[PDB]
Design a protein around this ligand. Sequence first.
Ligand SMILES: [Zn+2]
Length: 256
Amino acid sequence: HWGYGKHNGPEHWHKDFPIAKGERQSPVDIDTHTAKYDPSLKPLSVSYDQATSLRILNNGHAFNVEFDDSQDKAVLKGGPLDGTYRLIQFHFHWGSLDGQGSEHTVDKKKYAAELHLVHWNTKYGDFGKAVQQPDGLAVLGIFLKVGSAKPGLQKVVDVLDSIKTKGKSADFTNFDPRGLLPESLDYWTYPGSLTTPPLLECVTWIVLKEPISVSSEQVLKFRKLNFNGEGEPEELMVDNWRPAQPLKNRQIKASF
Ligand SMILES: [Zn+2]
C-alpha cells in the first residue's frame, strides 16, 4: 500500500520495509567536494546498439519502459562493475515544479527529474535472484534539467496519453535508449539501494555528472499522468521521488 502521499510516502515505508533505515539506502546527496577521484575506475561501457524495447507500463508509481533481457542485447559494463549487467527497464522520478523531482542531489541541488536505467548482473541468471545480492543491480542515474527539448525523449512523451492511469500499458517497440544519454559519461559511484519498496541493498549506483536538458512541455506531459487507476479519483503523478538518505559509512567515488 506504499506511495508518495502524506499517508503512505517515504516517512512511512520503514514500517513495512525496515531496511528503509539500513546502512546503504539510496538516494544520497553527492557532496562534490567530499567525493574523491578514483584513478583506478574504468570508463563506463554503455552498449545499447541491440537494445530491444517492448512495452511501456504505468505501474501507479512511475512509468517503466521494459526491454527484452532474455539475452545480452543492451548491457552496461566497466566503470566500478565486475562482469555484465543487462538493461531490463528505465523509468523517471519527477516533481510538481521544476525546482524538485530528482532523488540524488548534487551539493543539495535538486534537478527537475531523474532517469534510472536499471540493469541486472547476468551471473545471477534472472532479475529476481540479482536483487537478493549486494552486487545484483547497476542503476545508471541521469539528471534532467528544464531547457531545450531532448529529441530522444519525445517518443516517450508522445505515448503517455495512452497510459494515463495505473495498470495501463502500450506497445513500445524500437525505442533507442542511446537518445536519452548526455555527451559525457563522467560519473559518481557508490553502493546503495532501490529507491522504492522493497528498498533492497543490491545496487551499484552510477550517477552521471552531466544532466540532459528536456523542455518544459516534455516535463509538463510527465505531470499529466495519474497515480490512480481508471475510474478512480484523479491524483496527478507528481513528486514520485524519495529524498536523500544518510550516507553512513560510505564513500562516493568520482570517475573524473
Ligand atoms: Zn528509480
